[PDB]
Amino acid sequence: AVKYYTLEEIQKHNNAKSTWMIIHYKVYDITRFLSEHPGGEEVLLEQAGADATESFEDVGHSPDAREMLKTFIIGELHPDDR
Numbered sequence: 001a002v003k004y005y006t007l008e009e010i011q012k013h014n015n016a017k018s019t020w021m022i023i024h025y026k027v028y029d030i031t032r033f034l035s036e037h038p039g040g041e042e043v044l045l046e047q048a049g050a051d052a053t054e055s056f057e058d059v060g061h062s063p064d065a066r067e068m069l070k071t072f073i074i075g076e077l078h079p080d081d082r
């Protein structure tokens with residue numbers, strides 16, 4: 001079963017030492033990619049600990065980027081927060 005994380009817990013992972021993000025209700029820990037993102041680290045920090053779905057789609061990420069995203073998954077957003 002997937003683990004659920006609350007928005008309350010996810011918001012605590014909002015800096016360079018630990019960055020989590022929600023994208024389409026899936027929760028990712030991208031801390032280790034913060035310095036390797038082709039779009040740079042600052043745009044990730046700007047939305048660290050939050051739902052970045054809209055920004056991820058608006059930028060227009062490639063299929064390869066979406067396959068890479070799967071490698072950072074840790075769970076899904078708790079339903080009380082959906």
Ligand code: HEM
Pocket residue numbers: 021028030037038039040043044046047052055056059060061062063064065068069
């Ligand atoms: C945490 C999951 C994310 C992953 C795995 C990811 C991955 C990537 C990859 C692989 C690229 C290279 C081009 C491509 O393949 O599309 C890229 C480019 C980029 N990303 Fe992300 N990204 C993520 C989140 C974001 C977020 C949240 C933002 C917005 C704040 C963002 C903004 C950008 C920008 C501006 C570029 C470069 C411009 C572009 O080529 O149009 N990315 N990202």
